[PDB]
Each structure stands twice: as C-alpha cells, then as structure tokens.
Amino acid sequence: YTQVFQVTVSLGPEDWRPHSWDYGWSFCLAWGSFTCCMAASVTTLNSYTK
C-alpha cells in the first residue's frame, strides 16, 4: 500500500496531489503492532525451551 501510495502520488492523483504525504498517524502505530507481535513471540518460544 506504500507501493500504491508512492505510485499514485507519482501520478499526481486525478485532482488531489498534496504538498503533504505525511504518513499515518495510525500507520506509524500499525508499525508498533508489528513489534508487539514480535515481543509476544519471543517470550512464548522462551516458554517452549523450558
């Protein structure tokens, strides 16, 4: 979708091309959902070692 949003702004969308492109704000927070998957995964494989 960033590959989408890069290419669509590269078209300069039909009548809406911004001087923004300030990403998210929840997409920086959706990034934080990824590392919260990762911190959840390292501790439950740590229970697998015991």
């Binding site: 960033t2 590959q3 890069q6 290419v7």
Partner: peptide
C-alpha cells in the same frame, strides 16, 4: 522505494521456505 520492494517477494519467499523446511522436519521428528 519501488526498486527495493520487489525484492521483498523473494524475501518473504524465503520466509515461506523458512516454514516449509521446518514443517517437514516435524516429519523427521
């Protein structure tokens, strides 16, 4: 970014290969 993001497909293709080799190890288990 566009020239890089195409390399993600074989990068995730290794991540599927990370799963595909690991699951048949359970058949060796």
């Amino acid at each position: 970014l566009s020239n890089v993001a195409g390399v993600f497909y074989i990068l995730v293709g290794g991540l599927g290969l990370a799963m595909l080799v690991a699951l048949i190890e359970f058949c060796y288990k």
